[PDB]
């Protein structure tokens, strides 16, 4: 079951500038003291990005997934739970599910009967789906999660779902602080599912401020700088 909640107050979400973040390693190749230029779907520097707030007022919009999504969160107390991907997000089509519950992470490809407001209930209550006909995939591994910043890039090409991530300590209620941090590859799954929209999951306080941002990836050309150790330290957008 799922509780229909309408206690939130309707507010117009703010916007932010994604200054430099959004760089990931394009290929599985080691380079030292070399400047390399590549063409791939990246997030343009100084880009228009949305803003969402949790904790009161909260919101879980069904944002589109057109060509890739840059996901970041500087929140605390691991309010962020997971994501849902798919085309219709109901029982007639397959949907991708990723949650980080109290003990483990669950990755499934099932035609869930998603409720309109997925929500996780100390104690937790799984209240995001109702049914599951048959799942063609499963996977369990290490969880992905003064404040802590978690950045993610979700790419889905040629039937492969790719995930990159990077964790770094952050302070203050500032949004998207300046700096550089490359996103190392984390997980690759050969599901082969169409994805058009996605939604995030949080947990109610009773029955800790959380904020997250959503970017978008576009075909661009970048110039990445490699140090001698093999780490990407700086990058240049070739059409800024």
């Amino acid at each position: 079951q799922c509780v229909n909640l309408t206690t939130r107050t309707q507010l117009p979400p703010a916007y932010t500038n994604s200054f430099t973040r959004g760089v990931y390693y394009p290929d599985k190749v080691f380079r030292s003291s070399v400047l390399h230029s590549t063409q791939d779907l990246f997030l343009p520097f100084f880009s228009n990005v949305t803003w969402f707030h949790a904790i009161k007022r909260f919101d879980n919009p069904v944002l589109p997934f057109n060509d890739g999504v840059y996901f970041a969160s500087t929140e605390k107390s691991n309010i962020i739970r997971g994501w849902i991907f798919g085309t219709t997000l109901d029982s007639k089509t397959q949907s991708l599910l990723i949650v980080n519950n109290a003990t483990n992470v669950v990755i499934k490809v099932c035609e869930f009967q998603f409720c309109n407001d997925p929500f996780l209930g100390m104690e937790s209550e799984f209240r995001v789906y109702s049914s599951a006909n048959n799942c063609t995939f499963e996977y369990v591994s290490q969880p992905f999660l003064f404040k802590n910043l978690r950045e993610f890039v979700f790419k889905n090409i040629d039937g492969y779902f790719k995930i990159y991530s990077k964790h770094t300590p952050i302070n203050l209620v500032r949004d998207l602080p300046q700096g550089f941090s490359a996103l190392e590859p984390l997980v690759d799954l050969p599901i082969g599912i169409n994805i058009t929209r996605f939604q995030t999951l949080l947990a109610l306080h009773r029955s800790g401020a959380a904020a997250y941002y959503v970017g978008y990836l576009q075909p661009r050309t970048f110039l990445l700088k490699y140090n001698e150790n093999g780490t990407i330290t700086d990058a240049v957008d070739c059409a800024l």
């Binding site: 190749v29 080691f30 380079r31 063609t136 039937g159 492969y160 050969p190 082969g192 093999g230």
Partner: protein
């Protein structure tokens, strides 16, 4: 395969296999199986081709009904319980099961459908338990004249002949779709050598040269290195995680 019980003739259990490496070598190199027929492929080299999904159907039929399960064959069990399409990409495996499925006095735990309105469509399971009727006059839900029940039991006893003895049949179907392949055969790997001009195939990265120890510090996810000239000058062994 190594299962205690098998499904009924009319109701065949189907299991999907994916995302694992399949060692077929144990199958066709085993002499215990009495029937090993592969359609569309060869038992050898079969562990060199990749599919996306594999389906396994299990049931127990008669000794004379093993030849009845094949593309194009006709009969009672084949037409009305489990019918195979004319095209087939897989193998049919069957072996004698007298020691397990035969019991003194008759083993009547297995049922089957003998008469149906039409032959079953390929890869279709029929579990309907309805009073059949071959007469124009309806019997109105009770067995009467021209109204007979189509499901009867099998009798397995230790004294029957091999032609009537129980046989367990597993049908493996390899299907391929427009999705990344998930099932493949094992990748044989040889021992590595160093300080000798040899031909190397490092996880699909073929080449020729001399492999020595390395002082480079690869990142944990990186696999092979490259120079300014975009030529492979370093690599990491898939088995031992050291740089060469």
């Amino acid at each position: 395969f190594n299962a205690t019980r098998f499904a009924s003739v009319y109701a065949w259990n189907r299991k999907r296999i994916s995302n694992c490496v399949a060692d077929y070598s144990v199958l066709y190199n085993s002499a215990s199986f009495s029937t090993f027929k592969c359609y569309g492929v060869s038992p050898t080299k079969l562990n060199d081709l990749c599919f996306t999904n594999v389906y396994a159907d299990s049931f127990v039929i008669r000794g004379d009904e093993v030849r009845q399960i094949a593309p194009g064959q006709t009969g009672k069990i084949a037409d009305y319980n489990y019918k195979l399409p004319d095209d087939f990409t897989g193998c049919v495996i069957a072996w004698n099961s007298n020691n397990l499925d035969s019991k003194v006095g008759g083993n009547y735990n297995y049922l089957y459908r003998l008469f149906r309105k039409s032959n079953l469509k390929p890869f279709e399971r029929d579990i309907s338990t309805e009073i059949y009727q071959a007469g124009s006059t309806p019997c109105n839900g009770v067995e009467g004249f021209n109204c007979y029940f189509p499901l009867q039991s099998y009798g397995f006893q230790p004294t029957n002949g091999v032609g009537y003895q129980p046989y367990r049949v597993v049908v493996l179907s390899f299907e391929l779709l427009h999705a990344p392949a998930t099932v493949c055969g094992p990748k044989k790997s040889t021992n590595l050598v160093k300080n000798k001009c040899v031909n190397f195939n490092f996880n699909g990265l073929t080449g020729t040269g001399v492999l020595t120890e390395s002082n480079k510090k690869f990142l944990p996810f990186q696999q092979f290195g490259r120079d300014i000239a975009d030529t492979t000058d370093a690599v990491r062994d898939p088995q031992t995680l050291e740089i060469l």
